[PDB]
Design a binder for this molecule. Structure first.
Ligand SMILES: NC(=O)c1ccc[n+]([C@@H]2O[C@H](COP(=O)([O-])OP(=O)(O)OC[C@H]3O[C@@H](n4cnc5c(N)ncnc54)[C@H](O)[C@@H]3O)[C@@H](O)[C@H]2O)c1
Ligand SMILES: NC(=O)c1ccc[n+]([C@@H]2O[C@H](COP(=O)([O-])OP(=O)(O)OC[C@H]3O[C@@H](n4cnc5c(N)ncnc54)[C@H](O)[C@@H]3O)[C@@H](O)[C@H]2O)c1
Ligand SMILES: NC(=O)c1ccc[n+]([C@@H]2O[C@H](COP(=O)([O-])OP(=O)(O)OC[C@H]3O[C@@H](n4cnc5c(N)ncnc54)[C@H](O)[C@@H]3O)[C@@H](O)[C@H]2O)c1
Ligand SMILES: NC(=O)c1ccc[n+]([C@@H]2O[C@H](COP(=O)([O-])OP(=O)(O)OC[C@H]3O[C@@H](n4cnc5c(N)ncnc54)[C@H](O)[C@@H]3O)[C@@H](O)[C@H]2O)c1
Ligand SMILES: CCCCCCc1cc(=O)c(Oc2ccc(N)cc2C)cn1C
Ligand SMILES: CCCCCCc1cc(=O)c(Oc2ccc(N)cc2C)cn1C
Ligand SMILES: CCCCCCc1cc(=O)c(Oc2ccc(N)cc2C)cn1C
Ligand SMILES: CCCCCCc1cc(=O)c(Oc2ccc(N)cc2C)cn1C
Ligand SMILES: [Cl-]
Ligand SMILES: [Cl-]
Ligand SMILES: [Cl-]
Ligand SMILES: [Cl-]
Lengths: 261, 267, 267, 261
């Protein structure tokens, strides 16, 4: 029947109805998965948004910068899914880099305190999440994080590129640790998606050009307005169908990164 | 099934240890309807394929044969019925003459030999795609088999060069395939104990090569964060089926590593 | 000399086994005029640098110190004379607290520790470039030190993550540096027997880590087609000087591997 | 004094005065190197062109598809540089792919006989050259070939991209063999240069756009009309200043391959 039938999966990172996490969660539920959701800060808002999912799922608070949150997470998840049950899947869909580290703001003018906070949330927390949740994961399990290909520099993405580069490195080490539990760890490198995070002059035309250029570069085409292909890719990694891939990066980007022009 | 209703051509079965044999087995278990192609030893391939979960038509295909390639689409169509198309194609074909591997010095492989190996192992990926794309459905998937050649290694020699060529070919096939709504990708598998692999470890391409490849196998499992069972092609087969499925719809021109994660680890 | 007439800032000398010590030595032998920066143990650095081929001014620089960075250009200018500019900058600076390496579990490094290591090892490459670019000549060259982090490995742990960050930072520094006609690159060196390296092999970060890194060293020379002498930083120093010279004028945002070719070989 | 003083270096691949090899040879001679030149087919023409170099150098015939040429090469070189002397450097600057494997001609319509010939000349011959010349190279020596970054597909370059991908693989193995002699083997991945090989509709404007785009992508800028930066990079690899790099690729491309946009 379903790709993820009877799988118990934690999904972090829903803040709006256009969040990549929201669509991962939707597709997961459509594929039979039982979800536990984690949210940061605006919990009333997130509750409202998660009520728009196909099925009701427990919502837990998790600020990845808060050590007490991380320390209590496994026990809170356990209360949510019942004692004796474990997670088969964990989705990290969390990213942040202050504005000083982004966009038209000069690369050299981002204070390290700002960069450090961004690396904390966007890269380090992937290890933190794994640390907190691996002790309640089943063998055969899967941890997935969200990446945006940082192998080459580019305008605007700036210090977030550096954080993603750090994330890829972190992922390779998480895989070493996860392996001990029989759990895989991977990243999905997504093409650009018009989530509300796109906010990070003539931004509109330029973002549309990004869309047209990415679609042209991608041999199978690309639609920035549609998170679904990315959500399906995450679910694939959550499933039993990529059992020998770990510490690795799957590109759900239309194939654009394989083409120079 | 993961592949329910899908029509999929699978090449490259020669024995029951063939990676393609296991791709076929898993695909069938997941509801796929198959067309098989075999090279040269058709009687062998017939009795081998007779041990798959379901019966499937077996077609002849020598990728060096222009007539075979030119007639392939029509022969496949006769196999699956007029009006039907393929949703999937598996290229599981490789060859490099002995002079191009093992303890034979790298400089001593004649180009005639290397060129044959590149023909079969790399170019045929393009020519198969050319042959079959006009009878593939949008949403379709072409998959080939790779052995990561980004770094040199003992004994693999000119086959390494062939695989590097294959990776480059794959990126261009994706450009063509995309015009049909079809994806093209490679699976880079870890080392699998096929009959040939065991022979190599046992010194068939020379004793020094054997010892080196024995070490390669062992280091592979050591480096793989989830470990690596060289006697089990199933994880590789599942990965191929993942790419044949609707669940990786935005991946093309790319390489998926079904290697236990070994290529992500230095040691 | 390869670097005749060039004015070059070299950071990162702490002892006579420092990679930067040898970069400085070779640069001076090739006609370069140096400005040195030292962190914290200035008396030690003074007597160490006193053993270089020529005397060079020594300036204080803690890359975590905003005042140090803000005054650096002016202090360098006082060192080399008004009207003169730097043709070269060497970043040879790395640190990661012990919790972020060795047998200490990867999950147990507090972020405060990791963040300090990333500050010193990666961000400071940007901030040094910011500090010094306004007093660099067109044709100039910024070089930093890298240890290839494309694949994970034992014990290196969070320093690996720092180096991955450094590589990404380097690509952005190149975008800024290019506006001045300045190149930015990293040299990925093979493992060098510094005092710290020997300590690690001898179990200073834990016995299991020691054994793993001992094996890393040996496999490195094994895999390197020209071999690798871990007791000799000179080939690494020469490579840095190559990038500081006029002979790689079209390379920027990039990584040169001075590792014996080991990263090109699986085994 | 000179970067390559007293070094004996073989340079293949001069066909015109805009050949990358011609400028490698010019810069090498300016840096004190003694050269032996090899040429293919139009030897009268090549002689005329090589007379325009800073210093006279022996010209030897070498069709890399001709096994007798390869077999006699070391002895012919030895006659050129005198008995007892050896080569310190070898430049492979040779490339060919028939038109069917290029440009507007559909990727699928290149016959393998055409592709095979291109791979023979552009990739396999790098191993052949090394095989023929390594027995007369000094330890500390250097073999360099010319590459154009094939890690991603692109319009027009087509099957030549596949040949270059093959070349990079060949180079990693040549390095294993060259190492036994104390010799390095590397490739220089050049940005696009307006040599007469650029011939491979509105080609002019498009080639100019290639120039503007490459210059923009390259953080240090790029001039397609100027082979000199590439020639200097080859000489660097020929020199004693990159003694620990082998089996590797140096990018003389303005840094363009390190930037997505
Ligand atoms: N949108 C794109 O184009 C794109 C492309 C590739 C990769 N990504 C990655 O995908 C993931 C989701 O991004 P998105 O596009 O859905 O935008 P988003 O804003 O909807 O999701 C980002 C999430 O991070 C969460 N978060 C921020 N700080 C946190 C903290 N201290 N503790 C816990 N959670 C915190 C936010 O609350 C939010 O839900 C990120 O890692 C992002 O970098 C996005
Ligand atoms: N076994 C491994 O460890 C390993 C690892 C990674 C990738 N691969 C790749 O997987 C694929 C299958 O190889 P295998 O290991 O299952 O061994 P195999 O011998 O069972 O399969 C190779 C196939 O190539 C077919 N073939 C050879 N010449 C042909 C031609 N002219 N026309 C049509 N078919 C032809 C053979 O008949 C055979 O069925 C290859 O591309 C191989 O390089 C193998
Ligand atoms: N030794 C190896 O095998 C190896 C291999 C590849 C790359 N590297 C890199 O080479 C560089 C030099 O390291 P090394 O091996 O010569 O050891 P080292 O200890 O001799 O040099 C490291 C330097 O970092 C300086 N430093 C630390 N914190 C600083 C700060 N807050 N401000 C300014 N300087 C500071 C130290 O004072 C010291 O001089 C580093 O970036 C290192 O990671 C080392
Ligand atoms: N021009 C560019 O933009 C560019 C960019 C990157 C790499 N490259 C590479 O640089 C090298 C030189 O190319 P170029 O631009 O100077 O064009 P070119 O035509 O001037 O040089 C190519 C050379 O290959 C030689 N050659 C062809 N077949 C041969 C054979 N059978 N035997 C011996 N020699 C043979 C030719 O005679 C010629 O001298 C090539 O390998 C090419 O692919 C060129
Ligand atoms: C070349 C154009 C770059 C496109 C970037 C795509 C992209 C990549 C992203 O990583 C992203 O997510 C964030 C980015 C910043 C912050 N603070 C928070 C988040 C969640 C959004 N988008 C849209
Ligand atoms: C020396 C081999 C080490 C590589 C191990 C993995 C591996 C990689 C392979 O590409 C492979 O397939 C072939 C290789 C050569 C030929 N002629 C035919 C085939 C089918 C088998 N194996 C086992
Ligand atoms: C566990 C280490 C294995 C890596 C070997 C090579 C290597 C790589 C290095 O990056 C390195 O430099 C440091 C690493 C950490 C700190 N705190 C400070 C420094 C200066 C030393 N060495 C020797
Ligand atoms: C995206 C645009 C592609 C630019 C390609 C640059 C480029 C790369 C090349 O490899 C090249 O050299 C040849 C190519 C073909 C043949 N038959 C012979 C030769 C010598 C020329 N040029 C000009
Ligand atoms: Cl809660
Ligand atoms: Cl048939
Ligand atoms: Cl001072
Ligand atoms: Cl002659």
């Amino acid at each position: 029947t379903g790709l993820l039938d009877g799988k118990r999966i934690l999904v972090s990172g829903i803040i709006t109805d256009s969040s990549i996490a929201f669509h991962i969660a939707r597709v997961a539920q459509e594929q039979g998965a039982q979800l536990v959701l984690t949210g940061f800060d605006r919990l009333r808002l997130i509750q409202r948004i998660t009520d728009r999912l196909p099925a009701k799922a427990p919502l837990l608070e998790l600020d990845v910068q808060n050590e007490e949150h991380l320390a209590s997470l496994a026990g809170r998840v356990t209360e949510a899914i019942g004692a004796g049950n474990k997670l088969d899947g964990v989705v990290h869909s969390i990213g942040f880099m202050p504005q000083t580290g982004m966009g038209i703001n000069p690369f050299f003018d981002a204070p390290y305190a700002d960069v450090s906070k961004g690396i904390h949330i966007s890269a380090y927390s992937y290890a933190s999440m794994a640390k907190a949740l691996l002790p309640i994961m089943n063998p055969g399990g899967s941890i997935v994080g969200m990446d945006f290909d940082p192998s080459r520099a580019m305008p605007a993405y700036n210090w977030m590129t550096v954080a993603k580069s750090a994330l890829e490195s972190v992922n390779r080490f998480v895989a070493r640790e996860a392996g001990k539990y029989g759990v895989r760890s991977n990243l999905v490198a997504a093409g650009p998606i018009r989530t509300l995070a796109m906010s990070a002059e003539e931004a509109g035309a330029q973002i549309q050009l990004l869309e047209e250029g990415w679609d042209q570069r991608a041999p199978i085409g690309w639609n920035m307005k549609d998170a679904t292909p990315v959500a399906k890719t995450v679910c694939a990694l959550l499933s039993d169908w990529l059992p020998a891939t770990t510490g690795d990066i799957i590109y759900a980007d239309g194939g654009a990164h394989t083409q120079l022009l």
